[PDB]
Amino acid sequence: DKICLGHHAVSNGTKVNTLTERGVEVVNATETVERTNIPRICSKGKRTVDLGQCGLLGTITGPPQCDQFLEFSADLIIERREGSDVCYPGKFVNEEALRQILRESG
Amino acid sequence: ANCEGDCYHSGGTIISNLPFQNIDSRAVGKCPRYVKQRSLLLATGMKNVPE
Amino acid sequence: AIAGFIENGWEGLIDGWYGFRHQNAQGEGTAADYKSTQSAIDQITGKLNRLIEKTNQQFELIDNEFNEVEKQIGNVINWTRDSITEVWSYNAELLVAMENQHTIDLADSEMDKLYERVKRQLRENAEEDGTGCFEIFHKCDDDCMASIRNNTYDHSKYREEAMQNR
Amino acid sequence: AIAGFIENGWEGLIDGWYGFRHQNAQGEGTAADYKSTQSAIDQITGKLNRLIEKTNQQFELIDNEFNEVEKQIGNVINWTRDSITEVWSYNAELLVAMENQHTIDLADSEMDKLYERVKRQLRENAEEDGTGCFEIFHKCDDDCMASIRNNTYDHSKYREEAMQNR
Amino acid sequence: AIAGFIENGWEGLIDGWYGFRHQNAQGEGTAADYKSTQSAIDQITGKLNRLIEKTNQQFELIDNEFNEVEKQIGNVINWTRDSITEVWSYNAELLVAMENQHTIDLADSEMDKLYERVKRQLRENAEEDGTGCFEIFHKCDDDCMASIRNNTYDHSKYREEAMQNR
């Protein structure tokens, strides 16, 4: 005698925006911006190298502290602040370019 | 060596099945796109009209 | 004691997105429609992964924290990076916003498409109510209502009776 | 001597966005509808401030006019700034464009929602014209038309008369 | 043996985008509608040039291949250029995507606007089918169908006959 038609209508509502003054609210909505961090380096699956005191560029010249990684191979490289590419004092000409080249070397 | 992640930065690892992140703009890897907003909510349903 | 979508939604319906609600001689009922609900859910659920598209979204470092690059060029790098960040923030809020607007304008379209479907089932045996209901001009038992929902309403059977009641 | 929205708009109506226009035994009239007009104005007026959103839209200088920075890096700065400028120009024209398209597709939707509303008021006592009018099959005086506009049209009263005229 | 747009499209129609298909006492026919087809083609064809807008899309070089600029600043240039490239790729796919969505939602709107037009031509002499057809309750010869397509259907002539068949 009266058959009708309708939809969801949850009780509370939600937040989301559109191209208006916040526009509307909806029944269900999820997040898109990730705020959760892991204060570690999740290295499982990747062959990882923790260079430590070996400056990355050192792996080319071979100071003492880099003798560990003279012919290393890895998918993830972790530079540490304590590293240094030299033993006898001196700089690397166009150093950061060589670093960028080396981080994608495997 | 037992957790699995593909987006890294100075503060650690960002694991996320989401499109955007808010941790660090300088993050490297297969990261989400850094945005300035704390939160952006997707649809994911119909408009709500109570009874 | 019954109303449709034009007035309100239905907090009662839990087993679907859209549905039917009738009151016949036996009493009030409620159900759902699989077709339209799936027709909306299909388009809506994949939008996240539509945003998570990552063609070449990898990137390495150009600066470095430990041996800071020259002050001026580093300042330029921070400036450019912040500019691109503002751009991408704008693009993210905009994309979310019109994905939402499209979701809304989509969902209530799948509604009044189902409404018109039911009308075409009840071509001349019913008159529309204004709430989104349907005043039926015959006696529609539970089997008849079910025939409407399952889309097996042979209107020619009840037609002469209904138009007699007109 | 009268027509509706499907043919033309109404330069005469000044006190609203949408309205009614009837010709009865007493003569031609015109009015407005507060509900739909407000329903559109609400969504339309705030769009400017929707664009003027300024989260972190402040910025300082990185270069300077008086002591020009080194020629090469300054050239890079001008190049990057011009690139971002082209990006933001594109985004501005696009945002304006689809805000406009949404405004248009919105406004004429609030129209044929009101049209269907009036039809549901006049369920069986009238037949649609094609211009957006409504041929009423009874005698609808000014009080009756006003009952339509105020949404108090008890169609059951005039129904038997109308369907007699059918 | 005949159906309309709500069920399927028509691989047979070649001389237009939208059209009519009737079966009368003489047999099945098919035609096209110039008005709606042009109404869609007009909006659709220019979208390419709507994208090819080139206000200041010229650009010169800032770097050079032969005498490479200093390594660091050149690295910054490559980084910035790649960033802008990702931005413009995103904008291109998005613009294409919503130009397409607008095209689709436009085309099938020009369809059910024509459908409602034909209904307003056949106000009470026909009842809708559900497939997008129109069950006509009189005898509509080829000249009558042509009167429908050309929008010259004086429904008052066939009205009394049709409502007699009701």
XYZ file of C-alpha atoms in Angstrom:
655
model
C 0.000 0.000 0.000
C 2.939 2.332 0.680
C 6.265 0.763 -0.484
C 9.132 3.229 0.054
C 12.845 3.792 -0.625
C 15.689 5.095 1.531
C 19.350 4.897 2.479
C 21.987 4.750 5.230
C 21.672 7.649 7.729
C 24.170 6.885 10.466
C 23.484 8.675 13.736
C 26.522 10.904 14.308
C 28.157 12.029 11.050
C 31.679 12.903 9.921
C 33.879 15.821 8.813
C 34.834 15.748 5.171
C 35.174 18.696 2.770
C 34.091 19.426 -0.793
C 34.041 22.494 -3.050
C 31.876 24.470 -0.616
C 32.100 25.806 2.940
C 32.972 22.304 4.254
C 29.921 21.248 2.267
C 28.493 18.162 3.953
C 29.104 15.349 6.402
C 29.025 11.658 5.560
C 28.465 8.256 7.173
C 31.947 6.703 6.934
C 35.294 8.327 6.169
C 38.943 7.323 6.463
C 42.303 9.052 6.778
C 44.687 9.909 3.942
C 47.593 11.648 5.742
C 49.931 9.324 7.642
C 51.259 10.588 10.980
C 52.541 7.321 12.498
C 56.324 6.866 12.501
C 58.557 3.939 13.420
C 61.645 5.237 15.291
C 63.750 2.457 13.741
C 65.021 1.350 10.327
C 62.802 -1.482 9.085
C 65.439 -3.409 7.144
C 63.855 -6.850 6.702
C 64.000 -8.063 3.114
C 66.749 -5.610 2.134
C 70.446 -6.376 2.498
C 71.419 -3.455 4.728
C 74.807 -1.909 5.519
C 75.362 0.276 8.593
C 78.473 2.199 7.560
C 79.057 3.710 11.000
C 82.461 5.381 11.136
C 83.148 4.681 7.440
C 82.335 7.688 5.302
C 80.597 6.551 2.130
C 83.243 8.058 -0.158
C 85.867 6.325 1.973
C 84.714 3.018 0.480
C 86.428 4.239 -2.703
C 89.740 5.401 -1.202
C 89.947 2.851 1.614
C 90.943 4.508 4.882
C 91.297 2.155 7.869
C 87.747 2.639 9.189
C 86.413 1.649 5.736
C 88.355 -1.613 5.276
C 85.169 -3.433 6.324
C 83.219 -2.142 3.306
C 85.861 -2.029 0.570
C 83.757 -4.243 -1.744
C 80.398 -4.072 0.010
C 77.015 -4.609 -1.629
C 73.601 -3.635 -0.295
C 70.101 -2.446 -1.141
C 69.942 -0.004 1.793
C 72.825 2.255 2.849
C 72.771 4.036 6.214
C 75.153 6.968 6.578
C 75.949 7.877 10.181
C 77.093 11.296 11.362
C 80.306 9.864 12.855
C 81.605 8.747 9.456
C 84.555 10.229 7.603
C 85.875 9.486 4.116
C 89.509 10.341 4.928
C 92.378 9.542 7.266
C 94.991 11.982 6.015
C 93.307 15.416 6.045
C 91.662 16.582 2.845
C 88.399 17.144 1.015
C 86.528 15.424 -1.813
C 86.091 17.619 -4.889
C 82.402 17.627 -5.864
C 81.784 15.313 -2.930
C 77.996 15.378 -2.574
C 77.597 14.579 -6.274
C 79.723 11.463 -5.791
C 77.666 10.568 -2.714
C 74.387 10.871 -4.628
C 75.907 8.721 -7.372
C 77.011 6.118 -4.827
C 73.801 5.772 -2.798
C 72.090 4.218 -5.856
C 75.024 1.904 -6.642
C 74.027 -1.338 -4.931
C 65.793 -6.682 10.781
C 62.325 -8.121 11.452
C 60.165 -5.106 10.543
C 59.563 -4.328 6.859
C 59.485 -0.832 5.385
C 60.284 1.049 2.192
C 60.078 4.751 3.146
C 62.936 6.050 5.302
C 64.089 9.320 6.853
C 66.265 10.646 9.677
C 63.593 9.915 12.287
C 63.078 6.336 11.137
C 60.718 4.416 8.849
C 57.339 5.549 7.510
C 55.220 2.466 6.816
C 51.961 3.501 5.193
C 49.288 2.264 2.807
C 48.216 5.926 2.505
C 48.794 8.491 -0.277
C 50.207 11.322 1.852
C 52.320 11.724 4.980
C 53.147 14.484 7.463
C 56.349 13.278 9.157
C 59.245 14.717 7.140
C 59.449 16.432 3.756
C 62.972 15.065 3.189
C 61.849 11.422 3.412
C 63.376 9.095 0.816
C 62.294 5.832 -0.765
C 58.903 4.727 -2.037
C 57.293 7.302 0.221
C 53.872 8.940 0.183
C 53.714 12.567 -0.886
C 54.561 14.977 1.919
C 51.703 17.385 2.620
C 51.368 20.161 5.173
C 47.925 19.113 6.438
C 47.606 17.033 9.593
C 44.568 15.193 8.230
C 42.488 14.931 5.062
C 39.455 12.649 5.256
C 38.281 10.649 2.232
C 34.634 9.963 1.412
C 34.233 6.901 2.032
C 30.453 6.786 2.103
C 27.149 8.561 1.507
C 25.887 11.894 2.793
C 24.217 11.575 6.194
C 20.605 12.663 6.741
C 19.113 11.696 10.139
C 15.531 10.618 10.816
C 3.947 6.229 10.022
C 6.401 5.642 7.168
C 8.557 7.890 4.977
C 11.260 7.671 2.334
C 14.566 9.174 1.293
C 13.313 12.620 0.231
C 12.512 13.358 3.883
C 15.109 11.394 5.876
C 17.514 8.496 5.760
C 17.015 5.212 7.584
C 19.161 4.516 10.647
C 17.396 1.143 10.786
C 18.771 -0.344 7.566
C 22.052 -2.099 8.364
C 22.391 -4.825 5.723
C 22.864 -2.503 2.747
C 23.163 1.034 1.460
C 19.753 1.348 -0.228
C 16.597 -0.583 0.505
C 12.822 -0.852 0.526
C 10.338 -0.196 3.320
C 6.671 -1.120 2.968
C 3.540 -1.186 5.099
C 0.864 -3.595 3.858
C -2.101 -5.279 5.535
C 0.359 -7.547 7.372
C 2.582 -4.698 8.572
C 5.783 -2.692 8.168
C 8.905 -4.227 6.643
C 12.383 -3.268 5.485
C 14.956 -4.788 3.124
C 17.947 -3.861 0.948
C 18.936 -3.797 -2.726
C 22.152 -5.562 -3.727
C 22.435 -4.061 -7.222
C 22.530 -0.338 -6.414
C 24.544 -0.789 -3.204
C 27.239 -2.675 -5.107
C 27.005 -0.125 -7.931
C 28.052 2.601 -5.483
C 30.513 0.631 -3.326
C 32.415 -0.440 -6.454
C 33.039 3.169 -7.480
C 33.702 4.407 -3.942
C 36.090 1.895 -2.349
C 38.845 2.063 -4.961
C 39.278 5.840 -4.721
C 41.999 5.509 -2.072
C 44.206 3.403 -4.351
C 43.225 5.853 -7.094
C 45.061 8.425 -4.968
C 47.949 6.145 -3.931
C 49.076 5.914 -7.560
C 52.894 5.926 -7.439
C 54.408 6.020 -10.926
C 57.840 7.468 -10.048
C 57.041 8.740 -6.553
C 60.438 7.556 -5.309
C 63.082 10.172 -4.600
C 66.606 10.291 -3.185
C 68.308 13.093 -1.276
C 69.916 16.092 -2.936
C 71.077 17.828 0.252
C 72.502 16.103 3.350
C 72.176 16.654 7.089
C 75.743 15.924 8.181
C 77.907 17.991 5.800
C 75.614 20.921 5.030
C 75.901 22.151 1.442
C 76.906 25.770 0.813
C 74.619 28.140 2.692
C 73.168 30.003 -0.302
C 72.348 27.010 -2.513
C 70.978 25.186 0.525
C 68.694 28.144 1.201
C 67.498 27.931 -2.406
C 66.843 24.203 -1.931
C 64.753 24.800 1.189
C 62.798 27.527 -0.627
C 62.059 25.355 -3.670
C 61.158 22.330 -1.541
C 58.726 24.415 0.513
C 57.156 25.779 -2.679
C 56.606 22.282 -4.091
C 55.236 21.275 -0.688
C 52.614 24.030 -0.811
C 51.708 22.955 -4.358
C 51.262 19.310 -3.354
C 49.264 20.241 -0.248
C 46.879 22.269 -2.418
C 46.601 19.372 -4.875
C 45.926 16.893 -2.067
C 43.126 18.899 -0.453
C 41.590 19.624 -3.863
C 41.744 15.999 -5.017
C 40.217 14.805 -1.740
C 37.541 17.499 -1.986
C 36.295 16.643 -5.466
C 36.617 12.907 -4.856
C 34.239 13.536 -1.954
C 31.880 15.748 -3.977
C 31.807 13.111 -6.714
C 31.128 10.422 -4.105
C 28.162 12.354 -2.694
C 26.630 13.341 -6.036
C 27.136 9.701 -7.078
C 25.516 8.020 -4.075
C 22.238 9.949 -4.144
C 22.135 9.443 -7.921
C 22.142 5.654 -7.520
C 19.200 6.319 -5.176
C 16.815 8.172 -7.491
C 17.814 5.808 -10.273
C 16.430 2.958 -8.162
C 13.375 5.107 -7.386
C 12.626 5.584 -11.091
C 13.225 1.850 -11.582
C 10.521 0.992 -9.034
C 8.208 3.523 -10.701
C 8.713 1.817 -14.070
C 7.826 -1.437 -12.319
C 4.641 0.162 -10.919
C 3.853 2.087 -14.146
C 0.176 2.835 -13.488
C -0.771 0.805 -10.390
C 0.763 3.354 -7.997
C 1.130 7.101 -7.528
C 4.183 8.754 -6.020
C 3.915 10.129 -2.495
C 6.429 12.991 -2.294
C 8.518 11.378 0.451
C 9.935 8.863 -2.010
C 7.190 6.350 -1.158
C 4.661 4.764 -3.533
C 0.924 4.726 -2.818
C -0.194 1.422 -4.342
C -3.842 1.260 -5.431
C -4.324 -2.469 -4.881
C -3.634 -4.983 -2.103
C 0.065 -5.893 -2.204
C 0.856 -8.763 0.161
C 4.367 -9.738 1.250
C 4.770 -11.887 -1.865
C 3.753 -8.907 -4.020
C 6.181 -6.524 -2.294
C 8.880 -9.179 -2.695
C 7.979 -9.348 -6.387
C 8.615 -5.596 -6.541
C 11.990 -5.840 -4.798
C 13.100 -8.832 -6.896
C 11.914 -6.930 -10.016
C 9.271 -9.473 -11.057
C 6.238 -7.171 -10.772
C 3.961 -8.075 -13.661
C 1.933 -4.861 -13.469
C -0.643 -6.141 -15.976
C -2.093 -8.475 -13.330
C -2.913 -5.819 -10.717
C -3.418 -3.086 -13.338
C -7.181 -3.292 -13.919
C -7.818 -3.435 -10.163
C -5.549 -0.437 -9.515
C -6.904 1.789 -12.293
C -10.382 0.845 -11.120
C -9.368 2.300 -7.766
C -7.503 5.026 -9.749
C 0.975 33.985 -23.046
C 3.043 32.333 -20.306
C 6.059 30.008 -20.251
C 8.502 28.449 -17.815
C 12.174 27.724 -17.300
C 12.607 25.052 -19.992
C 12.055 27.745 -22.631
C 13.438 30.946 -21.075
C 14.330 32.641 -17.831
C 12.363 35.482 -16.276
C 13.851 38.980 -16.410
C 10.781 40.072 -14.438
C 11.501 38.210 -11.200
C 13.642 40.444 -8.985
C 12.863 39.350 -5.418
C 14.435 35.894 -5.662
C 16.311 33.369 -7.749
C 13.461 30.924 -8.436
C 9.750 31.594 -8.408
C 6.242 30.798 -9.586
C 4.180 32.360 -12.362
C 0.499 31.537 -12.801
C -2.432 32.661 -14.920
C -5.838 31.920 -13.385
C -9.310 33.361 -13.937
C -8.176 36.517 -12.114
C -4.983 36.928 -14.146
C -1.213 36.525 -14.377
C 0.982 36.596 -11.277
C 4.574 36.036 -10.209
C 6.318 35.234 -6.920
C 9.503 33.677 -5.516
C 10.577 30.677 -3.436
C 12.733 31.325 -0.371
C 13.795 27.711 0.220
C 15.480 26.891 -3.099
C 16.951 30.384 -3.547
C 18.624 30.164 -0.142
C 19.656 26.573 -0.899
C 21.686 27.838 -3.865
C 22.937 31.151 -2.434
C 24.309 29.326 0.621
C 26.497 27.078 -1.530
C 27.483 29.823 -3.975
C 28.455 32.850 -1.868
C 31.114 31.170 0.265
C 33.150 29.915 -2.699
C 35.333 33.039 -2.715
C 36.488 32.462 0.868
C 36.800 28.800 -0.122
C 39.485 30.042 -2.522
C 41.032 32.607 -0.146
C 42.099 29.803 2.196
C 45.526 30.842 3.528
C 47.076 28.122 5.685
C 50.754 29.130 5.367
C 50.444 31.464 2.379
C 52.920 33.880 3.967
C 56.411 34.061 2.511
C 59.564 36.116 3.026
C 62.240 37.038 0.499
C 65.070 34.733 -0.501
C 66.737 37.085 -2.992
C 67.125 40.865 -2.588
C 66.913 43.830 -4.946
C 69.748 45.965 -3.584
C 72.700 43.552 -3.291
C 71.960 41.095 -6.094
C 72.913 37.513 -5.241
C 75.430 35.702 -7.452
C 74.336 35.799 -11.082
C 73.981 32.046 -11.656
C 72.026 31.155 -8.509
C 69.866 34.238 -9.020
C 69.085 33.038 -12.537
C 68.073 29.674 -11.070
C 65.828 31.482 -8.569
C 64.080 33.452 -11.313
C 63.601 30.246 -13.326
C 62.116 28.305 -10.402
C 59.888 31.207 -9.348
C 58.531 31.540 -12.887
C 57.858 27.793 -13.012
C 55.891 27.876 -9.749
C 54.072 30.938 -11.087
C 52.933 29.041 -14.182
C 51.801 26.160 -11.951
C 49.758 28.447 -9.695
C 48.240 30.288 -12.663
C 47.083 26.958 -14.107
C 45.667 25.945 -10.719
C 43.853 29.269 -10.344
C 42.151 29.160 -13.744
C 41.237 25.496 -13.243
C 39.834 26.032 -9.744
C 37.799 29.023 -10.930
C 36.589 27.029 -13.936
C 35.246 24.033 -12.036
C 33.869 26.201 -9.237
C 31.885 27.897 -12.005
C 30.826 24.625 -13.658
C 29.721 23.309 -10.266
C 27.819 26.545 -9.629
C 25.944 26.248 -12.934
C 25.146 22.536 -12.672
C 24.049 23.262 -9.087
C 21.727 26.193 -9.786
C 19.634 24.525 -12.490
C 19.482 21.404 -10.307
C 17.808 23.333 -7.481
C 15.359 24.386 -10.215
C 14.132 21.003 -11.451
C 14.111 19.796 -7.863
C 11.527 22.491 -7.117
C 9.695 21.526 -10.321
C 9.391 17.900 -9.191
C 8.311 19.172 -5.762
C 5.398 21.096 -7.296
C 4.504 18.015 -9.356
C 4.354 15.899 -6.191
C 2.054 18.569 -4.767
C -0.163 18.347 -7.881
C 0.113 14.527 -8.150
C -2.887 13.890 -10.409
C -4.761 17.214 -10.630
C -2.368 18.624 -13.250
C -0.415 17.566 -16.325
C 2.986 18.947 -17.249
C 3.196 21.395 -20.138
C 6.701 20.997 -21.593
C 7.749 24.584 -20.866
C 8.023 23.825 -17.159
C 4.421 24.943 -16.573
C 1.557 22.903 -15.094
C -1.845 22.627 -16.776
C -4.233 22.393 -13.821
C -7.531 20.612 -14.504
C -9.624 22.527 -11.975
C -10.227 26.175 -11.058
C -7.302 27.373 -8.930
C -7.954 30.832 -7.494
C -5.278 33.054 -5.955
C -5.724 31.320 -2.597
C -5.237 27.944 -4.305
C -2.086 29.059 -6.144
C -0.812 30.475 -2.849
C -1.535 27.092 -1.267
C 0.689 25.552 -3.947
C 3.535 28.008 -3.356
C 3.310 27.689 0.443
C 3.214 23.875 -0.004
C -0.229 23.374 1.554
C -1.954 21.920 -1.527
C -4.270 19.208 -0.251
C -4.687 17.540 -3.646
C -7.453 15.245 -2.363
C -9.893 18.178 -2.309
C -9.576 19.159 -5.982
C -8.717 15.603 -7.083
C -12.160 14.256 -8.017
C -12.956 17.447 -9.944
C -9.632 17.324 -11.812
C -9.751 13.632 -12.743
C -13.339 14.199 -13.831
C -11.933 16.778 -16.233
C -8.978 14.366 -16.765
C 11.912 -7.243 -30.327
C 12.925 -3.650 -29.574
C 14.609 -1.894 -26.644
C 16.013 1.488 -25.679
C 18.968 3.142 -24.005
C 18.300 2.004 -20.424
C 19.100 -1.563 -21.500
C 21.679 -1.194 -24.291
C 23.084 1.160 -26.876
C 22.498 0.856 -30.607
C 25.374 -0.352 -32.784
C 23.013 0.167 -35.727
C 22.703 3.954 -35.539
C 25.509 5.488 -37.600
C 24.177 8.875 -38.731
C 24.081 10.486 -35.285
C 24.747 10.170 -31.582
C 21.146 9.887 -30.348
C 18.107 8.721 -32.255
C 14.661 7.160 -32.339
C 13.615 3.573 -33.002
C 9.969 2.628 -33.484
C 7.923 -0.415 -34.433
C 4.474 0.401 -35.828
C 2.014 -1.534 -37.982
C 4.338 -0.973 -40.958
C 7.472 -2.139 -39.137
C 10.689 -1.248 -37.325
C 12.557 1.975 -38.068
C 15.489 4.024 -36.821
C 16.561 7.666 -37.127
C 18.675 10.326 -35.397
C 18.234 13.658 -33.615
C 20.321 16.602 -34.816
C 19.662 18.884 -31.833
C 20.958 16.733 -28.966
C 23.831 15.248 -30.993
C 25.089 18.732 -31.844
C 24.471 19.817 -28.242
C 26.977 17.192 -27.079
C 29.492 17.373 -29.948
C 29.791 21.145 -29.462
C 30.861 20.734 -25.835
C 33.055 17.693 -26.483
C 35.165 18.517 -29.552
C 36.723 21.736 -28.267
C 38.127 20.163 -25.094
C 41.458 19.385 -26.775
C 42.087 23.045 -27.617
C 40.803 23.780 -24.110
C 43.861 21.821 -22.961
C 46.274 23.213 -25.580
C 45.899 26.693 -24.084
C 49.373 28.268 -24.297
C 49.478 31.669 -22.602
C 53.235 31.873 -21.904
C 54.110 28.210 -22.438
C 57.324 29.203 -24.220
C 60.600 28.710 -22.385
C 64.309 29.080 -23.113
C 67.225 27.141 -21.652
C 68.796 27.919 -18.298
C 71.432 25.168 -18.362
C 73.422 24.044 -21.424
C 74.634 20.694 -22.728
C 78.057 21.694 -24.046
C 79.634 23.679 -21.184
C 78.013 22.066 -18.149
C 77.260 24.538 -15.358
C 78.819 23.974 -11.930
C 78.037 20.487 -10.661
C 76.096 21.459 -7.526
C 73.815 24.105 -9.047
C 73.250 21.844 -12.047
C 72.174 19.073 -9.685
C 69.727 21.509 -8.083
C 68.398 22.395 -11.548
C 67.811 18.744 -12.437
C 66.061 18.198 -9.091
C 63.750 21.201 -9.496
C 62.979 20.369 -13.130
C 62.060 16.798 -12.189
C 59.817 18.083 -9.391
C 57.947 20.422 -11.749
C 57.716 17.530 -14.209
C 55.995 15.331 -11.626
C 53.618 18.205 -10.820
C 52.690 18.727 -14.475
C 52.264 14.989 -15.069
C 49.827 14.826 -12.146
C 47.965 17.867 -13.488
C 47.779 16.366 -16.981
C 46.350 13.017 -15.881
C 43.900 14.757 -13.539
C 42.726 17.253 -16.163
C 42.263 14.470 -18.720
C 40.432 12.370 -16.129
C 37.829 14.951 -15.149
C 37.425 16.161 -18.727
C 36.507 12.545 -19.471
C 34.192 12.200 -16.459
C 32.477 15.446 -17.447
C 32.162 14.189 -21.028
C 30.491 10.959 -19.888
C 28.135 12.538 -17.350
C 27.314 15.105 -20.056
C 26.547 12.703 -22.904
C 24.053 10.516 -21.040
C 22.453 13.689 -19.661
C 21.676 14.949 -23.171
C 20.057 11.516 -23.591
C 17.524 11.541 -20.751
C 16.821 15.179 -21.524
C 15.652 14.076 -24.976
C 13.722 11.223 -23.337
C 11.810 13.647 -21.104
C 11.251 15.854 -24.163
C 9.547 12.996 -26.023
C 7.481 12.255 -22.906
C 6.282 15.869 -22.799
C 5.327 15.441 -26.453
C 3.374 12.262 -25.590
C 1.958 13.685 -22.317
C -0.918 11.236 -21.821
C -1.131 9.198 -25.049
C 1.748 6.905 -24.034
C 3.169 5.133 -20.996
C 6.868 4.584 -20.405
C 8.255 1.087 -20.887
C 11.288 0.840 -18.587
C 13.772 0.241 -21.410
C 13.526 3.869 -22.488
C 10.757 3.032 -24.980
C 7.228 4.474 -25.116
C 4.126 2.280 -25.333
C 1.753 4.379 -27.444
C -1.960 3.712 -26.904
C -3.106 4.615 -30.413
C -2.087 3.752 -33.981
C 0.973 5.834 -34.888
C 1.844 5.492 -38.573
C 5.155 6.572 -40.102
C 3.848 10.124 -40.501
C 2.878 10.154 -36.812
C 6.274 8.853 -35.661
C 7.898 11.461 -37.908
C 5.696 14.077 -36.240
C 7.131 12.916 -32.909
C 10.738 13.111 -34.107
C 10.233 16.514 -35.764
C 8.492 17.686 -32.546
C 5.114 18.414 -34.158
C 3.061 15.898 -32.149
C -0.263 17.576 -31.451
C -1.223 15.195 -28.643
C -4.768 16.594 -28.446
C -5.673 14.822 -31.701
C -4.800 11.276 -30.598
C -5.542 12.003 -26.922
C -9.183 10.901 -26.661
C -8.414 7.690 -28.566
C -5.404 6.922 -26.351
C -7.091 7.613 -23.006
C -10.015 5.545 -24.248
C -7.518 2.714 -24.632
C -5.902 3.977 -21.372
